[PDB]
Amino acid sequence: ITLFVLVSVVEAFIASGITDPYEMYKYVHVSEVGNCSGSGMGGVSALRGMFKDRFKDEPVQNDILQESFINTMSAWVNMLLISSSGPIKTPVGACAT
Amino acid sequence: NKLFVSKEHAPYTDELEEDVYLDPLARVSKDKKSGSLTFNSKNIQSKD
Amino acid sequence: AMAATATDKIGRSVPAPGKGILTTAREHHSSVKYASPNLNMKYRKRQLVTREAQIKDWVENELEALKLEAQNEFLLERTREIHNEAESQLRAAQQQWGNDFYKRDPRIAPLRGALATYGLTIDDLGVASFHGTSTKAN
Amino acid sequence: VTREAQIKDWVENELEALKLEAQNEFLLERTREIHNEAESQ
C-alpha cells in the first residue's frame, strides 16, 4: 500500500508542476506543508505477517509492526520525498476516508 | 524509470536544522555548487 | 490555549523521535531592538474600543436606511439581520485584537502568542508533562 | 468598499503617530508592523 501511496504522491506533484518538492520551501516555511491523507485499514499485509506468518514461524522482518500503521504511509512519504515539519493528521474513515 | 527520486538529505544539515525550525522566514535557495535547493546559513534569522 | 502537530524530516527510521515540534517556538529575532506594540495588551484594547465605536456608527446608518425601506413582518426580518451583521463585526474585531493578534506576526511564536492572549508570559508556563516513555532516545 | 475606506483612515493615523514617536531602525521596524496590521484589517 505504501508503494501505491509513494507513486501517487509523486504523480500528484507532477500534476501540480512541482518536480522537486523542495521548491515548496522557497515560498513557505517547513512547518507549513501538511499531510492529511489516511486509510481505512493501513498495511494489512504487515498485519497478516504479525498475526499469521509469525504464528507459523515464517521469516518475518523484525520491524513488521511499524509497517502496518495507518499513519506509516504518510511517515514514509515525508521521510523519502517531502521532509516537512508541518501538521500530520491521518484520518481513518472506512469508505469515507 | 526515474519519475520517483528518493531524497537522500533534508534541505538543511543537522547543524542548521533547529535554526531552520525556529526561523519562520527561513527559505531555501539554489546551491551554487550542487545546484540543489538547500537552506543557507546567511539566510537564517537575517534582516533581509 | 494551543495545540499543534509536526513531522520531522528525511530519514529511514520510522520509530525514531525527532524535533519538528520545536517549530511551535519559531520566532524571527533579526530585529528585536524595539518592542512590538502588538504584544502589549493595553495597546490592543485601545484599537478594539476604537473599532467598536465605528461599528455602532455603522449600525445606526443601516437601521435608518431600513426605516425608509419600510410593515411588522418586513421590519422584524430585516432588523434581525442588521443586528446579526453588527455582532459579526464586533466578533471579528475581537478576533483581530484579542484572539489572533499574533498569527500574522513573525516576531511572535505561536507558543508565546497563545500565552500572551491571556496576559501570561513564557515564564508563566510552570509544568511540562513529558511523553516520558523511559526509552533512552525519547 | 465602505470598510476599506475606514481602514486607510486608520492607517494614516497610526503612521503619523509613529512619525512623532521618532531613526532608521526604529521607523523600519514599526512601519512594517502598522502596514501588517492594515493588511489584517
Swiss-Prot record, chain B:
Question: Which residues pair up as cystines?
Answer: none
Q: Which organism is it from?
A: Saccharomyces cerevisiae (strain ATCC 204508 / S288c)
Other observations noted: Present with 17000 molecules/cell in log phase SD medium.
Q: Which family does it belong to?
A: Belongs to the thiolase-like superfamily. Fungal fatty acid synthetase subunit alpha family.
Q: What is its biological role?
A: Fatty acid synthetase catalyzes the formation of long-chain fatty acids from acetyl-CoA, malonyl-CoA and NADPH. The alpha subunit contains domains for: acyl carrier protein, 3-oxoacyl-[acyl-carrier-protein] reductase, and 3-oxoacyl-[acyl-carrier-protein] synthase. This subunit coordinates the binding of the six beta subunits to the enzyme complex.
**Assembly and binders:** [Alpha(6)beta(6)] hexamers of two multifunctional subunits (alpha and beta).
Superkingdom of the source species:
Eukaryota
**What is this protein called in UniProt?**
Fatty acid synthase subunit alpha
UniProt's post-translational modification comment states:
4'-phosphopantetheine is transferred from CoA to a specific serine of the Acyl carrier domain by the C-terminal PPT domain. This modification is essential for activity because fatty acids are bound in thioester linkage to the sulfhydryl of the prosthetic group.
Q: Which gene encodes it?
A: FAS2
Phylogenetic classification of the source organism: Eukaryota, Fungi, Dikarya, Ascomycota, Saccharomycotina
Q: Which residues of the full protein are shown?
A: 1695 to 1742 of 1887
